[PDB]
Amino acid sequence: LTPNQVNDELNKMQAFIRKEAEEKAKEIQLKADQEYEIEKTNIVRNETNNID
Amino acid sequence: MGATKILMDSTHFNEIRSIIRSRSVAWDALARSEELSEIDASTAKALESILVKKNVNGKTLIPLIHLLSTSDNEDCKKSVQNLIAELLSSDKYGDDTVKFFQEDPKQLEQLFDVSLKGDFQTVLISGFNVVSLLVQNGLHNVKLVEKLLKNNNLINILQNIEQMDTCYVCIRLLQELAVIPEYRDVIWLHEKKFMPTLFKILQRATDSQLATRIVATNSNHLGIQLQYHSLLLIWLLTFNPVFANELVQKYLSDFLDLLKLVKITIKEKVSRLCISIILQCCSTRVKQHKKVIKQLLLLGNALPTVQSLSERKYSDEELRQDISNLKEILENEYQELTSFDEYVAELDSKLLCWSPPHVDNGFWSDNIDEFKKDNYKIFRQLIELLQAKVRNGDVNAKQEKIIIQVALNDITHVVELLPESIDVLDKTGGKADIMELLNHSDSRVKYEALKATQAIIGYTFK
Amino acid sequence: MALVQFYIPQEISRDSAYTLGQLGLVQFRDLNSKVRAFQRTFVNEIRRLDNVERQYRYFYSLLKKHDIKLYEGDTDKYLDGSGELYVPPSGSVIDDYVRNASYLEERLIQMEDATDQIEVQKNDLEQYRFILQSGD
Amino acid sequence: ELYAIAKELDSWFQDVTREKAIFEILNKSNYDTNRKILIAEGWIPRDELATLQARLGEMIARLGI
Amino acid sequence: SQKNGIATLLQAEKEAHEIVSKARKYRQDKLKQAKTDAAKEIDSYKIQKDKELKEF
């Protein structure tokens, strides 16, 4: 009902949304790095067999 | 210049950094009191005066780094480590400190001496300061992370669940250090003492109510970040095939409780990592995935809870794709096994367990024709096992109660599918065991034996 | 503090905030559905409403199979004694509620069919027993 | 079985009513977006949450958290 | 400022959705770089095999 409580709740909601977006971006980056590392390792072994 | 923002969005490290920075003692008074060097106090006062007002500055970090390793006072090492951690953690000021620390290799070993020594706050700031220099692409060392994890002061603060700042800072430092491929090998060797606190935090969060505003293990910003970092620390090391089968084989009991956290929780962060851990362990990349999926499906029964957890949908739909891939991989892996060799091996092993595909009428109807080679020798062996376990061995107990109800429920579908199974039960003597077990305890097994006796009674009189 | 969510038009937000403010509600701020990630439009709420309708049909099927009168609840307030015990203050989980009642409804239907078949077979055999003895 | 599930059916109906009210308050359809476009949030106490849900109001719905 | 927090929260949600889309784009770019990184890591092993065969 107060005017400052809407700005404080909007700032806390924006900070929570920014923290959730940063956590989702960090988890997506970690999963993409793990999948790229697994695919690079599989391709590296798949070339290393015929090279050997 | 341009240090990473790791440990810069957590209020737990900023609360201890603001609490230590609010009560910073004078280095000149401690130097006059015979507690520290005068050059380290004047250099720390010049760096503290040039950090706030000003932010050449990196040259004064060597006297505080040498004074922190030479001295043994946690009051000066905590204030100097908070000032060096505040300049190294920031990205607007203190750019020469990261270049001077990364350029000098002796500063990493000199800064690592303060970790595990003194107060818990100075060891927590020194562990994050050593983890920030170890996380860079210019210097790396597994002996510092292995020696820091082998210490008692570092694991003692993270093992305590009373302080969420030290446990969240240690789990966040181990989870941030676990992103590197070199630290994942050394982190998996020392993961035999701190692993039980992560399951105890999720069990304490699931055991508590979600309508409270206390951020310990609840649905607040601190509890979701602590449980998300604790689940992300095992989720980062869960990408290995040997660690997934070894962690699923050793910690399958504690790993089976992670499915209830996604259903009991309302946020998709813990449910995405909880379903992502079982989806990563259920992937066909580790050795003996069918044994872990068969042991978790038969013993754990994660396949029926995955269908109930799949009904809830929210944002971050990649966790829902991991739940659909885990449900399809669990359903395909469970249906891909032989029912005759699994049923004969389970009957010969003297252990019965329920499953989604084992309780189907098509498997009993298909195995009823192949089982007929000795006049129902398989059904007579299962009825001889249920009558042997129920007759002698404290029947209606803990051990024989699962195989009695599973043998009665499995025998009910075989009795309903074929009307010729009454001769196998009458020849062995298992017909009286259903009538005697129908009027005792275990009323679910009495309902299964009452369903088999009603199925035999339906074919006995028409 | 417990989080509260309200749904109404934007024209009556002043009267809803004034009427809700007299009960203990504070920090009332109007927002939109797109601003809230959890309160956004999705088909998961429609599928959960379909599962809640299947659980409501299973409750009527269990009430009809139980041989009792139709009970009418709809209580959501925590001020009453039965409403506080039958309704928790936290969020509702439809997965444990549907999965906890589906196997009980299927086992109750199978137990009712087995009891009806056993009663019909016992009534048929007891009816034909004296006719078979008198005919024999 | 009936004595074991008789209270669970009555509790499941009351939980299903608030579960349907939360789904209707969630705005999971296109008609609910063009009808109830205002969604506000606020901080209320745990003891006052039971007293706030006692009044049904006119068009506003309450959800416990 | 009742009518400003909805637009500010919508702009913050659009910035968070753009950050999540940038994280998904970097996640696809990691495998897109690893797809060339596999043959780029195999060529250094083939050249090391030829360098190990030239000594024999």
From Swiss-Prot, chain A:
Presence of the UniProt keyword Transferase in the record = no
Q: Where in the cell is it found?
A: Vacuole membrane
Task: Tell whether Acetylation is among the UniProt keywords.
Answer: yes
Keyword set, alphabetical order:
Acetylation, Coiled coil, Hydrogen ion transport, Ion transport, Membrane, Transport, Vacuole
- Give the source's domain of life in one word: Eukaryota
One BP term from GO:
proton transmembrane transport
Coiled coil ranges: 8-38
Region Interaction with VMA5: list its residue ranges.
1-13
Enumerate the residue ranges of region (Interaction with VMA10).
Answer: 12-31
As one GO molecular function, the record gives: proton-transporting ATPase activity, rotational mechanism
GO cellular component assignments: fungal-type vacuole membrane; Golgi membrane; membrane raft; proton-transporting V-type ATPase complex; vacuolar proton-transporting V-type ATPase complex; vacuolar proton-transporting V-type ATPase, V1 domain
The family annotation for this protein states: Belongs to the V-ATPase E subunit family.
Report the function annotation for this chain: Subunit of the V1 complex of vacuolar(H+)-ATPase (V-ATPase), a multisubunit enzyme composed of a peripheral complex (V1) that hydrolyzes ATP and a membrane integral complex (V0) that translocates protons. V-ATPase is responsible for acidifying and maintaining the pH of intracellular compartments.
Q: What else is known?
A: Present with 16134 molecules/cell in log phase SD medium.
The identity of this protein, by name, is: V-type proton ATPase subunit E
Gene source species:
Saccharomyces cerevisiae (strain ATCC 204508 / S288c)
In the UniProt record, the gene name given for this protein reads: VMA4
From-to range in the entire protein, with total length? 8 to 59 of 233
Swiss-Prot record, chain B:
- Where is the protein found, in the record's own terms? Vacuole membrane
Protein function: Subunit of the V1 complex of vacuolar(H+)-ATPase (V-ATPase), a multisubunit enzyme composed of a peripheral complex (V1) that hydrolyzes ATP and a membrane integral complex (V0) that translocates protons. V-ATPase is responsible for acidifying and maintaining the pH of intracellular compartments. This subunit is essential for activity, but not assembly, of the enzyme complex. This subunit is also required for silencing the ATPase activity of V-ATPase when V1 is detached from V0.
Q: Which family does it belong to?
A: Belongs to the V-ATPase H subunit family.
Which terms are listed as keywords in the entry? Hydrogen ion transport, Ion transport, Membrane, Transport, Vacuole
Oligomer status and interactors = V-ATPase is a heteromultimeric enzyme composed of a peripheral catalytic V1 complex (components A to H) attached to an integral membrane V0 proton pore complex (components: a, c, c', c'', d, e, f and VOA1). Interacts with YND1.
Q: How does it sit in the membrane?
A: Peripheral membrane protein
What is this protein identified as? V-type proton ATPase subunit H
Q: Which GO terms describe its molecular function?
A: proton-transporting ATPase activity, rotational mechanism
Q: Any one Gene Ontology biological process term? A: Golgi lumen acidification
Disrupted gene: phenotype observed: Increases the ATPase activity of membrane-detached V-ATPase V1. Abolishes growth at pH 7.5 and in the presence of calcium chloride, abrogates growth at pH 5.0.
| First and last residue of the signal peptide | none
Which Gene3D superfamilies has this protein been placed in? Leucine-rich Repeat Variant, V-type ATPase, subunit H, C-terminal domain
UniProtKB/Swiss-Prot annotation, chain D:
On the tree of life, the source organism's domain of life is Eukaryota
Locations listed in the record: Vacuole membrane
PTM description: Glycosylated.
Function of the molecule: Subunit of the V0 complex of vacuolar(H+)-ATPase (V-ATPase), a multisubunit enzyme composed of a peripheral complex (V1) that hydrolyzes ATP and a membrane integral complex (V0) that translocates protons. V-ATPase is responsible for acidifying and maintaining the pH of intracellular compartments. Is present only in vacuolar V-ATPase complexes; enzymes containing this subunit have a 4-fold higher ratio of proton transport to ATP hydrolysis than complexes containing the Golgi/endosomal isoform and undergo reversible dissociation of V1 and V0 in response to glucose depletion.
What family does this chain come from, according to its entry? Belongs to the V-ATPase 116 kDa subunit family.
Record note on quaternary structure: V-ATPase is a heteromultimeric enzyme composed of a peripheral catalytic V1 complex (components A to H) attached to an integral membrane V0 proton pore complex (components: a, c, c', c'', d, e, f and VOA1).
Fill in the misc note: Present with 55714 molecules/cell in log phase SD medium.
Name the record gives this protein:
V-type proton ATPase subunit a, vacuolar isoform
- The source organism is Saccharomyces cerevisiae (strain ATCC 204508 / S288c) (Baker's yeast)
The shown residues of the full protein are 298 to 362 of 840
Curated annotation (Swiss-Prot), chain E:
Q: N-acetylserine-modified residues are where?
A: 1
Record flagged with keyword Secreted: no
Chief localisation class: membrane
For the keyword Nuclease, the answer is no
Keywords, in A-Z order: Acetylation, Hydrogen ion transport, Ion transport, Membrane, Transport, Vacuole
| Other remarks in the entry | Present with 2280 molecules/cell in log phase SD medium.
Annotated family? Belongs to the V-ATPase G subunit family.
For this chain, one GO molecular function annotation is: ATP hydrolysis activity
Name this protein carries in UniProt: V-type proton ATPase subunit G
Please spell out the taxonomic lineage of the organism that makes this protein: Eukaryota, Fungi, Dikarya, Ascomycota, Saccharomycotina
Relate the protein's function as given in its record: Subunit of the V1 complex of vacuolar(H+)-ATPase (V-ATPase), a multisubunit enzyme composed of a peripheral complex (V1) that hydrolyzes ATP and a membrane integral complex (V0) that translocates protons. V-ATPase is responsible for acidifying and maintaining the pH of intracellular compartments.
- Signal peptide per UniProt: none
Q: Which cellular compartments is it found in?
A: Vacuole membrane
- Included range, full protein: 2 to 57 of 114
